[PDB]
Design a binder for this molecule. Structure first.
Ligand code: HEM
Ligand SMILES: [Xe]
Ligand SMILES: [Xe]
Ligand SMILES: [Xe]
Ligand SMILES: [Xe]
Length: 153
C-alpha cells in the first residue's frame, strides 16, 4: 500500500506528462520497442514499423500512446482504488492481446526511463521509488486478475 505522500510524488510527475501526453507516449513506446524488440511482435497493428524514424512518423502509434498513458493516468489518479479500471484491461490483455507480466515489467521500465530523462525536476530518487511502487502495485493486481481469468501471464 502506497502512502499519500508517495501518491503525490506519482501525481506530481504525471502532471508534467500531461503537458504533452502524445510526446511522452511516443518516447515510451519507442523505448519499449527498442529495448525489447519482442514486445513489438504483440502489435499486429505496429509490427511493420522497421525503424525509430518510422515509429516517430506514425500518427497511429502516437494515438495509441495517448490511449495507453491516459488509461494508466486514470488508474494512478485512483490511488490504489482501481478495481473498475483494471477489470477490462486485465481481460483484454490476458485473453485478446496475450501480454505476459514480463512485458508489463518492460513497459514499466520504459516509463521510468523516459520520466527520469525528461523530468529530473520531479523524478528524483524519492519520486522514482514512488512511481516504481505504483507500477509494481499495478502489475501485482493485474497478475492476480490474470490468474482469475485463467491466464498464466
Ligand atoms: C502500462 C500498461 C498498459 C496499459 C495501461 C495499456 C493500455 C491499453 C489500452 C487502454 C488499450 C485499448 C483497449 C484494450 O484493448 O484494452 C490497449 C490495447 C493493446 N495493448 Fe496495451 N497497455 C499496456 C501495456 C501493454 C504492453 C506492454 C503490450 C505489449 C507488449 C500491450 C499490448 C496491447 C495490444 C497489442 C493492444 C491492441 C492494439 C490494437 O491493435 O489496437 N499493452 N492497451
Ligand atoms: Xe505508452
Ligand atoms: Xe495492462
Ligand atoms: Xe504496468
Ligand atoms: Xe496502480
Amino acid at each position: 500500500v502506497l502512502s499519500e505522500g508517495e501518491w503525490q510524488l506519482v501525481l506530481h510527475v504525471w502532471a508534467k506528462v500531461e503537458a504533452d501526453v502524445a510526446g511522452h507516449g511516443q518516447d515510451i513506446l519507442i523505448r519499449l520497442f527498442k529495448s525489447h524488440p519482442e514486445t513489438l511482435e504483440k502489435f499486429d497493428r505496429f509490427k511493420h514499423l522497421k525503424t525509430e524514424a518510422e515509429m516517430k512518423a506514425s500518427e497511429d502509434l502516437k494515438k495509441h500512446g495517448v490511449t495507453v498513458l491516459t488509461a494508466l493516468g486514470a488508474i494512478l489518479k485512483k490511488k490504489g482504488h482501481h478495481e473498475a479500471e483494471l477489470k477490462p484491461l486485465a481481460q483484454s490483455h490476458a485473453t485478446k492481446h496475450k501480454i505476459p507480466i514480463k512485458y508489463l515489467e518492460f513497459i514499466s521500465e520504459a516509463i521510468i526511463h523516459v520520466l527520469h530523462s525528461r523530468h529530473p525536476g520531479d523524478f528524483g530518487a524519492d519520486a522514482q521509488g514512488a512511481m516504481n511502487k505504483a507500477l509494481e502495485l499495478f502489475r501485482k493486481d493485474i497478475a492476480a486478475k490474470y490468474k482469475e481469468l485463467g491466464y498464466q501471464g
